[PDB]
Symmetry: C4
Subunit: 226 residues, 4 copies
């Protein structure tokens, strides 16, 4: 009565192949003409692929010793979430708010990183180094917030474009920490009006960079040790 | 008569929570309409928060064994400086020179990194690696100064914008070492007139980069060792 | 009857010198006037250099113990491929499709990295670290594909320039991961129309960067170990 | 009769202080008005500083055991070269070709890195890692040359600006390897005409980057070892 043996060689291979085909079709469908000429087929195949993933994860669930740890392990929670999101897409297909709904029709491909064990191990390892660089991110958040607040009150009425709110300015402070056109297009047109403005960026760009550098190093000599 | 026990669990927790609320309100206040509609409340809460921080640091001072090392430790000096700067803001509120005065109303949030011990330890560690990369910064300063002097006499009358003074040119030499639009907007419009100008940037961008790279490495294989 | 001894000191030296001269002439020939004034000489020297390389590699082949491992080693396969490509150039000289044919007249210089042993060892070592960073590249490919698909359906009709197809958009997603004008010229003119668009880039630029950082580290603490 | 003892504490201190003052004055002199109003003083002080450096290095020479190794050590050769260059400036002051002559009036400050021993040791160490990354630079040179040649024949008549010669194009290939506006301003206006052009940059920007990354790593795990 118990479901004892369920696993075999292609038990995954077929799933990953199917996911690849899913990616292929969901990519193709993004062409206006080709999609607009064969819509019934795309409809039917999307439905059937949805149902395959559904019955797949359900098969694993039922044959995963329910009362013991299946929903206890996070990976399967992630799989389940992905399938539920595809279902949300389906059963709430096209009321109106579809623009940010068709998108979820895509991420069903990234469950690839769940099935192939090497990618699973790699991604879990990558996440396991997030609590390593924990504090540094808090420091960087403090830094960003302080500088955003300081900017939005200084340059509010000289550059409404970049420094207009605490939200909008929290953008200009991001595309500057990445050293992206921070001089000729963020500063030179401001530094022209308020001449003492430079002390802002030349400070931020400095200290920000420093922190980032150290953050990077903080990880490097952590894997030499572990 | 002596103040023996003063510490407990929330002895910090309440302070850091209050600081968070301080950040929240000082952020909100940067909206023109919302601040302009409820100013009395913002006034009163700013005053009361100021007084809370004041009585807090004073409590620590009095219950910090005055004659022994309290003002001897630098962190408390930093705290005291921050509180005094907020006070400078208050008692010298709005004579006229307020533009660069309201700013100090902000950095009172960064004393967060003082109170939570993990951030304190991290920041102290980060500073402790400044005397490590001591010389390299002297070398980089020499380099910057030399190249600024060399530029301002060559391109003074062909590009008044970027190379106009030893000060202004010390900017163009900064937004070039960060590889920010150094070619199409700093050089191509100059390289057009003085054709041999390229040897300037292609030298600087080279050597500067080299130094920086080495500086970075100079830190990396210093934490593998310590 | 067997070819026993074939090697000596300059056995390579002459070849690398000749290759250097080949580079020199193939570089010179890219000037319109100078090439257009002495074409017969360039013709004849190109022919003779081709034949020198031909007889060279053929000499090695015949005096490389044919039945045993000569074509078994990959380097010689690469050499042979290069010579055959030069020959393809010659015997299929100028039917019409020459634009992407004259190019192969160039890469015959890079066989330099085959002959000088230090470069050979270095390049082989560099390649030997490709299977090291194997998975991370698969993860990055998945990431790129997902984000390209997600972009091309959102911004298809607001920015036909950058996001027009799954191909063209796979470019805009490349010159953004390199942080090249990703804000002022890829996003600000889009973020103006669809205001919620920022969550796209600020996500990608984030996660992409993270992956890349880790990839880099994944190699660093792999040479400390091997 | 022999010069036995010549060294003492300030034997350097005075020299480095004087060099600092030299930097200060040579910087000041770059202002048009201020220099144009007091020229006699600047003249006389430049002359006297020149003579101080002269007599200084000559003192060291004579009291450096001439027949034994003084000119044998490279640092003193560098010092001597710098002083001779200042002298070239003086005795060949203003015939006409002064534009690239006043410049040498500057680098006399960088002899600072000779006198202060910490900087001397650091700079010598930095140079001692140039023969470490020897081959990689040869590989990068090969790469640059190949791609420059390949570009200048493809895009010669569609973008005369960037790809016009083997020299000029060797610039556009430099401000692209640094990821500086390589997409929106080097490629998009070219990729519009020759549509298959992308395979150029997306290749170069790829492989170049790879090499650079590896070069960096090639140094990192060389100081963990030495
Ligand atoms: C394991 C999970 C990872 C996922 C990896 C991906 C796995 C699955 C990959 C799936 C790829 C998706 C395929 C979609 C292409 C459909 C063909 C097409 O559109 O032709 C179009 C033409 O267009 C052309 O002329 C050229 C078509 C090739 C461009 C495809 C780019 C490659 C994407 C690869 C991305 C690689 C991702 C990595 C990137 C670093 C037709 O439309 P049209 O404009 O009307 O032209 C009319 C032509 N006609 C006259 C003949 C009618
Ligand atoms: C790990 C986390 C680390 C956190 C560290 C983060 C550090 C925070 C970084 C803060 C950056 C500072 C930004 C302020 C500079 C811009 C000001 C400006 O431009 O306005 C005016 C400059 O008016 C002046 O004269 C100011 C001259 C220098 C003031 C320096 C301010 C230092 C603030 C305290 C320093 C505290 C130091 C530290 C304290 C402990 C411009 O002129 P105006 O008056 O507006 O006149 C009208 C405009 N008009 C000119 C067109 C007519
Ligand atoms: C531990 C110390 C670290 C500090 C961390 C921060 C801790 C404290 C954080 C404090 C955050 C500050 C809150 C201020 C927002 C007030 C609400 C508001 O302005 O609404 C405005 C609307 O605006 C909107 O429509 C959207 C509002 C959300 C934008 C807030 C950005 C989040 C900042 C988070 C930064 C994260 C920092 C990290 C970033 C990496 C109302 O103004 P209006 O334009 O007139 O609109 C009219 C609307 N009405 C019709 C209803 C009237
Ligand atoms: C760790 C710290 C390391 C420090 C190292 C830092 C190194 C310092 C780096 C210095 C960079 C050098 C910058 C100078 C190049 C630009 C000059 C120029 O463009 O002007 C002229 C070029 O006129 C020429 O013909 C010059 C040709 C090459 C001269 C090379 C100068 C080397 C100086 C000595 C080298 C010393 C080497 C080292 C010595 C020990 C332009 O033409 P024009 O004459 O003006 O004519 C009028 C304009 N017109 C054309 C429109 C009509
Ligand atoms: C080991 C394998 C690695 C390969 C390494 C390379 C090894 C082999 C290197 C080969 C180099 C190729 C030489 C070609 C130059 C020919 C001379 C010429 O064109 O003169 C032109 C003038 O142009 C000038 O005025 C200046 C010429 C010097 C520019 C050459 C750039 C150096 C390229 C080095 C690249 C270094 C690569 C590294 C870069 C990091 C003449 O044409 P014109 O316009 O009509 O002028 C008329 C003048 N006239 C009046 C006198 C008639
Ligand atoms: C290692 C690999 C890691 C892979 C991770 C990769 C993660 C993937 C990253 C995906 C990035 C997400 C991009 C979507 C954001 C842009 C949407 C947009 O702008 O359209 C609309 C926003 O409409 C809204 O109101 C949306 C508000 C936020 C929605 C957030 C979407 C999250 C999707 C699920 C999150 C799943 C989380 C994870 C699930 C497990 C714009 O407005 P409009 O509706 O079009 O109205 C008409 C236009 N008009 C405004 C001009 C009138
Ligand atoms: C150890 C070796 C390493 C070398 C390190 C350097 C050591 C030696 C450093 C020497 C520094 C050189 C000093 C030159 C300044 C002269 C004063 C001046 O020009 O005033 C001008 C005004 O200009 C101003 O209004 C502000 C002047 C300060 C700008 C100086 C920038 C600091 C350079 C520091 C670079 C730091 C390098 C590091 C950078 C990272 C006057 O000219 P004017 O325009 O006509 O104004 C009229 C005013 N008036 C009405 C009163 C008349
Ligand atoms: C460590 C050192 C490593 C060294 C590695 C360095 C590798 C070297 C990297 C070289 C980069 C390659 C650059 C060439 C691509 C651009 C060509 C182009 O755009 O012209 C044409 C594309 O015409 C085509 O149809 C070409 C289609 C793809 C050809 C691929 C070329 C591969 C060359 C061999 C590959 C060898 C692989 C390796 C061999 C061993 C454009 O069209 P048109 O024909 O001009 O028509 C007229 C213009 N019109 C369109 C406006 C009307
Ligand atoms: C916190 C970082 C600062 C560093 C200080 C270092 C010394 C800083 C030197 C001088 C500082 C003060 C100069 C006096 C001028 C002040 C006001 C002024 O006139 O501004 C003038 C220029 O403003 C500049 O020139 C900014 C200088 C950029 C510094 C880049 C240093 C990079 C450090 C290297 C990092 C690597 C090593 C890192 C080692 C730490 C502009 O105003 P104006 O001339 O009156 O003209 C009117 C305005 N107008 C232009 C719109 C028309
Ligand atoms: C110090 C670094 C230099 C490196 C030298 C290497 C060889 C350098 C090769 C040739 C050097 C000399 C060429 C002769 C031309 C001189 C004058 C000239 O005519 O300029 C011409 C172009 O100027 C250029 O082309 C600059 C070349 C950029 C070099 C990029 C190398 C990157 C090294 C790779 C780094 C990685 C490996 C690093 C390994 C170290 C322009 O003048 P014009 O043509 O007469 O036209 C009139 C002016 N006009 C354009 C405004 C209309
Ligand atoms: C996934 C990453 C997100 C991070 C969230 C963090 C908090 C994010 C805070 C607030 C989030 C939501 C704000 C409410 C506004 C939503 C809609 C909106 O109005 O947009 C508004 C602005 O949009 C922005 O301001 C984007 C904020 C950029 C975030 C940069 C954070 C960098 C993290 C640091 C990385 C280092 C540490 C990393 C630690 C992880 C624009 O719309 P509008 O105002 O209505 O005006 C009409 C549109 N118009 C402009 C075209 C005219
Ligand atoms: C060597 C690197 C290549 C990689 C291949 C990967 C798959 C490449 C996918 C498809 C390749 C071929 C697509 C078919 C189109 C060919 C011709 C064409 O039409 O071009 C079209 C677009 O051209 C592009 O879209 C270029 C795609 C950029 C690739 C970015 C991948 C980054 C790798 C990630 C690095 C990280 C991981 C690294 C893992 C290695 C434009 O031509 P058109 O549409 O006809 O319109 C007319 C021209 N017009 C626009 C001027 C009007």
């Amino acid at each position: 009565k118990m479901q004892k043996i369920v696993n075999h060689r292609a038990f995954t291979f077929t799933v990953i192949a199917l996911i690849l085909f899913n990616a292929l079709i969901v990519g193709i469908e993004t062409y206006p003409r080709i999609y607009a000429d064969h819509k019934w087929l795309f409809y039917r195949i999307d439905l059937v692929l949805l149902w395959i993933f559904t019955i797949e994860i359900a098969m694993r669930f039922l044959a995963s010793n329910p009362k013991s740890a299946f929903f206890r392990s996070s990976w399967n929670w992630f799989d389940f979430l992905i399938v539920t999101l595809s279902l949300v897409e389906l059963f709430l297909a096209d009321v109106e708010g579809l623009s940010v709904l068709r998108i979820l029709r895509v991420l069903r491909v990234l469950r690839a990183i769940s099935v192939v064990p090497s990618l699973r191990r790699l991604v879990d390892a990558l996440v396991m180094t997030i609590p390593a660089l924990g504090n540094i991110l808090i420091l960087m958040s403090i830094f960003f917030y302080i500088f955003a607040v300081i900017g939005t009150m200084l340059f509010q009425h000289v550059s409404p474009e970049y420094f207009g709110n605490l939200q909008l300015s929290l953008l200009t402070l991001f595309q500057v920490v990445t050293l992206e056109s921070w001089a000729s297009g963020v500063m030179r047109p401001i530094f022209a009006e308020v001449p003492w403005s430079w002390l802002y960026f030349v400070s931020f760009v400095l200290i920000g960079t420093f922190i980032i550098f150290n953050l990077f190093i903080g990880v490097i000599v952590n894997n030499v040790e572990k």
